Design a protein around this ligand. Structure first.
Ligand SMILES: Cc1cc2nc3c(=O)[nH]c(=O)nc-3n(C[C@H](O)[C@H](O)[C@H](O)COP(=O)(O)O)c2cc1C
Ligand SMILES: Cc1cc2nc3c(=O)[nH]c(=O)nc-3n(C[C@H](O)[C@H](O)[C@H](O)COP(=O)(O)O)c2cc1C
Ligand SMILES: CCOC(=O)/C(=N\O)C(=O)CC
Ligand SMILES: CCOC(=O)/C(=N\O)C(=O)CC
Ligand SMILES: CCOC(=O)/C(=N\O)C(=O)CC
Lengths: 361, 360
């Protein structure tokens, strides 16, 4: 089964092609993770996935999405991740982390607590930042302040500091969150970036924040550990042909800047779109990025059945299959997949205290 | 769905009828649980089960099955369970514990490391105790030492101390392990109990260790928290009708002694048996014990599908359905069952960080 072949990238070897993509839990306090996260991540790692990318972790307080988001903006925040890193490794999985800045989508309620921008008189809310003073709209009406050049320098340094903290906490894989309408994606998109300086306008200028952030992180993140990014390559906004061509060109420049693998996603930069949700719908687009930019890729958004995952690997559309919600439903999804794909000794996808009994069940 | 109706026993209310029965993990060291157990129990509790009975926990070192078994024979051992109690409660489940003594089946290798008695030359092993100096046989050939009267008093006190520790660690449900061929079951069974003193021979004498242990635990375990036991009610040894009748009579005595619920199982006292493994096969026997002894019951051994579990409750064969191996496969099995049984807002069987997204 292709899904259960190992994968080597730099000094990291994953035991299979099942990756758990970053999934915010909204359970942190002042950026500090706790026993929610410890059990959540350790249990999924024991389930058999080869790579576990920890949820979007804010590089700065105002870069959280919500008051429940994890942060890594201080050394104390980084130290809180050490037991998570070590528990993932103890389970035989590889610990990664996505470092992030929510941009104009920040200062929002948890999804089950309204999912919308926090009211201005609520002490929990904060002023958001973005390339331009333009609101997302819909449930996120707050207008961000437009970043200064000093803000751009500061946020880049926050990404650098976060990457060095992640390295010292023991993460073996890093993902820069340049997708999903957050700060990096919003610098790239003409919908959200109306700047008139070196960071807006032309393709080079709109790419600049992302390329400079990557280059600054590349200095501090080790060459021997995968340096990855998540990027929304189209918006489903009626501009898909031109946006794909630009996004693929940016992927080529990411590769020239030392990126090892690209997590291919959707932009979600504005609400006025028509995303054609369906099983494995990103497969063909991820394959085009992989082939045209000549970089390994992962993707998500509907690959969460064993056969869909296997087919995407056999078609060389992906190098790793990211399976998110299925792992919230069943932390042992990798074992479920091993059974469904007929892996020999499938129960030994799990540790011995489970595997021994399930072999004979 | 009957499987998702709450259950009240004494002061405890379970959010549904799904119980996770005790399942040894073989991952402790010197009786002390660790990160293996912490994540294992917390994750299953978040999965939605209403009751989580922690694995057989030895009341004394020689009462472990293996060198990896949990213990509660000191106050430090009990404190190690506190974070497990807290995590189970934080998930909205109810924490229970099975306290145990493996008797002649003790001093064995872990199941994936041979599953057999540790050899006499191997310093990891220890001398085992039992009612009589007679081996289980098969893969457990070591002949135990027959307990002295002082040994019997000591083991009873160990059960008392274990129950007191479980109480003060915050467990809300206790289960005495009188099943599965271990010490308590082996006092009851004529196969293993050849004693000629007050603890063997007649029905009263064979029951005595179990009834005295229950009574001693009763003096320390709170009246307002369920006091339960697991007991093998037949062996499938060609003596089933007589063994069932006297096991049910003992259950009546347990009831009179304050037992709140009986986990009905098989004896496993000797290897020479013919157990008819199959889906929900214990249903009819559990129902007979429940009805004849007038005690609430749970059982296991093949109820691990949503429809089998639901059917057993609708038929009033069980009060709680114990689902073991399915929770090792999927620690969110209760959520899987809620979906299968058409529970409204089934995803909210899980906590919010999962439930919100799975609803959509
Ligand atoms: C609860 C939840 C939280 C998420 N948080 C993140 C995140 O922190 N960073 C990110 O890039 N994507 C995040 N996503 C998107 C997922 O990584 C993934 O792309 C999505 O769940 C689709 O994959 P699936 O169909 O296998 O669930 C999240 C998704 C969910 C359901
Ligand atoms: C790994 C494992 C460990 C077990 N440990 C215990 C135990 O500590 N105490 C006990 O009374 N039964 C124990 N059992 C028996 C189970 O509680 C249960 O009766 C059995 O798994 C059958 O239920 P199931 O068909 O739902 O798995 C164990 C079973 C398994 C698979
Ligand atoms: C809908 C696109 O946005 C996401 O997938 C997401 N959370 O839901 C994140 O990226 C959190 C950082
Ligand atoms: C300096 C080179 O940049 C370009 O010419 C360009 N657009 O202006 C593209 O590459 C389109 C993606
Ligand atoms: C023979 C059946 O015995 C069991 O089910 C069991 N473990 O497998 C225990 O009870 C451990 C205390």
């Amino acid at each position: 089964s292709a899904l259960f072949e190992p994968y080597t990238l730099k000094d990291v070897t994953l035991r299979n092609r099942i990756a758990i993509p970053p999934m915010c839990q909204y359970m942190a306090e002042d950026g500090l993770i706790n026993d929610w996260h410890q059990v959540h991540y350790a249990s999924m790692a024991r389930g058999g996935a080869g790579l576990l990318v920890v949820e979007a972790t804010a590089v700065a307080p105002e870069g959280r999405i919500t008051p429940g988001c994890a942060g890594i903006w201080s050394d104390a925040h980084a130290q809180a991740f050490v037991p998570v890193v070590q528990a993932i490794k103890a389970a035989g999985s590889v610990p990664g982390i996505q470092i992030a800045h929510a941009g104009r989508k920040a200062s929002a309620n948890r999804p089950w607590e309204g999912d919308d921008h926090i009211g201005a008189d609520d002490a929990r809310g904060w002023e958001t930042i973005a390339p331009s003073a333009i609101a997302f709209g819909a449930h996120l009406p707050n207008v961000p302040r437009a970043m200064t050049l000093d803000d751009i320098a500061r946020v880049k340094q926050d990404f650098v500091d976060a990457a060095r903290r992640a390295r010292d906490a023991g993460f073996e894989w890093i993902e820069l969150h340049f997708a999903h309408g957050f700060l990096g994606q919003s610098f790239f998109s003409e919908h959200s970036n109306k700047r008139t300086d070196a960071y807006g306008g032309s393709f080079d200028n709109r790419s600049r924040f992302l390329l400079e952030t990557l280059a600054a992180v590349r200095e501090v993140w080790p060459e021997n550990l995968p340096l990855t990014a998540r990027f929304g390559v189209l918006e489903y906004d009626g501009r898909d042909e031109q946006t794909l061509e630009e996004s693929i060109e940016l992927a080529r420049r990411f590769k020239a800047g030392g990126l090892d693998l690209l997590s291919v996603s959707v932009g979600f930069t504005i609400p006025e779109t028509n995303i054609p949700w369906g099983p494995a719908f990103m497969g063909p687009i991820a394959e085009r990025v992989r082939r045209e930019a000549k970089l390994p890729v992962t993707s998500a958004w509907g690959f969460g059945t064993p056969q869909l995952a296997e087919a995407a690997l056999q078609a060389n559309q992906l190098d790793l299959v990211s399976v998110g919600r299925a792992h919230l439903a069943d932390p042992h999804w990798a074992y479920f997949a091993a059974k469904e794909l007929g892996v020999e000794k499938a129960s030994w996808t799990l540790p011995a205290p489970y595997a021994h009994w399930l072999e004979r069940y």
